[PDB]
Amino acid sequence: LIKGPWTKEEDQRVIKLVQKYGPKRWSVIAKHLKGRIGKQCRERWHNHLNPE
């Protein structure tokens, strides 16, 4: 599956998964999110959820 814009639910899940696995292991994190691959989760984290 392929998803477009991120939902608030997805964002919250990414936050919880990063807490569990660390801001890495993106492939593992992505396995829990339907329609998302590792790089998408990585970019969402660095650009939107935890910006510098």
Output 20 or 52, the one with its CB closest to Na ion: 20
Residues engaged in binding Na ion (CB under 5 A): 30, 33, 36
Q: CB of 34: closest distance to Na ion in angstroms? A: 6
Q: How far apart are CA 30 and CA 24, in angstroms?
A: 11
Output 34 or 52, the one with its CB closest to Na ion: 34
Q: How far apart are CA 23 and CA 3, in angstroms?
A: 21
Q: CB of 10: closest distance to Na ion in angstroms? A: 11
Q: How far apart are CA 19 and CA 31, in angstroms?
A: 15
